[PDB]
């Protein structure tokens, strides 16, 4: 087999020193540098991973399109649909209860 | 499989019969499931010492070190409930 | 490098003044029209000789054209 060497001067297998050995022209293999695996967005209430948003590095969200870093809904990109649905029902039902309980019962 | 050394069989023969018997009672309770006080599902499992999380129900409950509710904290809950009634009613 | 897909978009590339150079590579099966623009190198894979000649005529006369064959320049 073909053995390879690090290209940069980092000699230790740290988290930021990940490599991939891929085949090149002529049969020789070159060394790449692979990105770290990143987490996604979580709902602020239930801590569940949000859908519709990619799991990329924080600085790479700026390069994405405007619609690719959020969801077209209230609290989109910070609250899940279950998280939001309870917020709406909490807001309406509590105010309605206050209207009859107090406020000229 | 084993006559009487059920869960402390992982300790082999190296901690004394009584010490293995004392910890056997605690480890059975520590790793068991408990009935969720809010959704009544046998799904509460300890994560850290004093933190009990209810799996299929999404609740985090503070409790005992190795059981969901201690007997000392059970009477305190009933003591405070009785004291609150006396304060509320005269 | 980006690839244009059908015959319409390539013409608008030569019609536009953003062009910088054109290289035509003839392969054993098809011929590629590589338009060197400011940012990218657009290429069109033409498999029809009749439409290849039409694209050759549409090249503005004031731009450099490189014809490549089995031997590179």
């Amino acid at each position: 087999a073909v053995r390879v060497t690090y290209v940069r001067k980092h000699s230790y297998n740290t988290k930021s020193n990940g490599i991939r050995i891929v085949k090149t022209a002529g049969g020789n293999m070159t060394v790449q540098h692979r990105q770290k695996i990143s987490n996604g967005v979580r709902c602020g209430d239930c801590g569940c991973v949000l859908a519709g948003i990619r799991h990329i590095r924080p600085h790479q969200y700026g390069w994405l399109g405007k619609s690719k870093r959020t969801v077209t809904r209230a609290y989109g990109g910070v609250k899940c649909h279950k998280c939001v649905q309870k917020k709406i029902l909490r807001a309406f039902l509590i105010n309605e209860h206050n209207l009859i309980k107090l406020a000229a019962a | 499989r084993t006559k009487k050394v059920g869960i402390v069989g992982k300790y082999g023969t190296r901690y004394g019969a009584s010490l293995r018997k004392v910890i056997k009672k605690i480890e059975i309770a520590q790793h068991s499931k408990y009935v969720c006080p809010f959704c009544c599902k046998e799904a509460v499992r300890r994560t850290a010492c004093g933190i009990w999380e209810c799996k299929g129900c999404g609740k985090q409950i503070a409790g005992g070190a190795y059981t969901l509710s201690t007997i000392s904290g059970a009477t305190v809950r009933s003591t405070v409930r009785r004291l609150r009634d006396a304060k509320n009613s005269q | 490098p980006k690839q244009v897909q059908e015959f319409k978009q390539i013409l608008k590339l030569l019609k536009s003044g953003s062009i910088r150079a054109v290289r035509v590579k003839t392969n054993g099966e098809n011929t590629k029209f590589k338009v060197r623009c400011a940012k990218y190198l657009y290429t069109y894979i033409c498999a029809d000789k009749a439409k290849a000649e039409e694209l050759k005529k549409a090249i503005p006369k004031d731009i450099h054209v490189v014809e490549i064959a089995k031997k590179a320049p």
Binding site: - | G50, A62, T70, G73, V76, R77, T79, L83 | -
Partner: protein, 246 residues
């Protein structure tokens, strides 16, 4: 002679607390008008494990009484607290588990925890696992109340000293027998450097006052006065009694 290990512990070089992963300081919120004369509501967002302490900690979020924003707190969780719970702090708070009330509002016999020794000092007593203090009696003549500390001693505090109603979570932690020296080694991961304790008799005369001779023995009485200088105060200090009590 040399300096004993008890003396080297006071300089605090390798004996400093291993408090790097700790959540923070666990205490009540700073006392303001809205808690002296009214009540505030706090949401229990999560319950976490504070390294180095046996009881869980609660991340309570009070909204704000005077400005716009949030007030993120960090309480010592009472047994029975759950995520999403509403707790109330204030003079007019109801007598429920987890609420923080002035000690004078608690009826006699109430079980409280995280009691303040001085009003507004954010909790001193009854903070370890499963620990609590009991209200003994009140005294409206001088605005003072009596409570029973977890050690059994009685203490007289101002009636507006604050405490949380309930038991500190995590009780029964010390009833589980450590079996391995490794488990005891991990217990002090977020604590001080104390664990592997070499007996004084096993040392040399230079190292310890117990450093013996040809036979491992102390040689002199192990009960000492409180006025003994550091470096000789090894053993039992001001021991009223001694031996297996009956």
């Amino acid at each position: 002679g040399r300096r004993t290990l008890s003396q080297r512990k006071g300089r605090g070089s390798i004996f400093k607390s291993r408090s790097h992963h700790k959540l923070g300081v666990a205490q009540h919120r700073a006392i303001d008008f809205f808690e002296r004369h009214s009540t505030v509501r706090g949401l229990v967002k999560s319950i976490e494990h504070d390294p180095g302490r046996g009881a869980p900690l609660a991340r309570v979020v009070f909204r704000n009484p005077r400005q716009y924003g949030l007030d993120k707190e960090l309480f010592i969780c009472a047994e029975g607290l759950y995520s999403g719970q509403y707790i109330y702090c204030g003079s007019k708070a109801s007598l429920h588990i987890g609420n923080v009330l002035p000690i004078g509002q608690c009826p006699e016999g109430t079980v409280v925890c995280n009691v303040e020794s001085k009003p507004g000092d954010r909790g001193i007593i009854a903070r370890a696992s499963g620990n609590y203090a009991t209200v003994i009696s009140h005294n409206a003549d001088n605005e003072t109340t009596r409570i029973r500390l977890p050690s059994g001693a009685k203490k007289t505090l101002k009636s507006n000293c604050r405490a949380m109603v309930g038991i500190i979570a995590g009780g029964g932690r010390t009833e589980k027998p450590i079996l391995k020296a490794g488990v005891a080694y991990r217990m002090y991961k977020a604590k001080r450097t104390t664990w592997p304790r070499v007996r004084g008799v096993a040392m040399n005369p230079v190292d310890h006052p117990h450093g013996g001779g040809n036979h491992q023995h102390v040689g002199h009485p192990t009960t000492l006065k409180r006025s003994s200088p550091p470096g000789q105060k090894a053993g039992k200090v001001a021991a009223r009694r001694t031996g297996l009590i009956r």
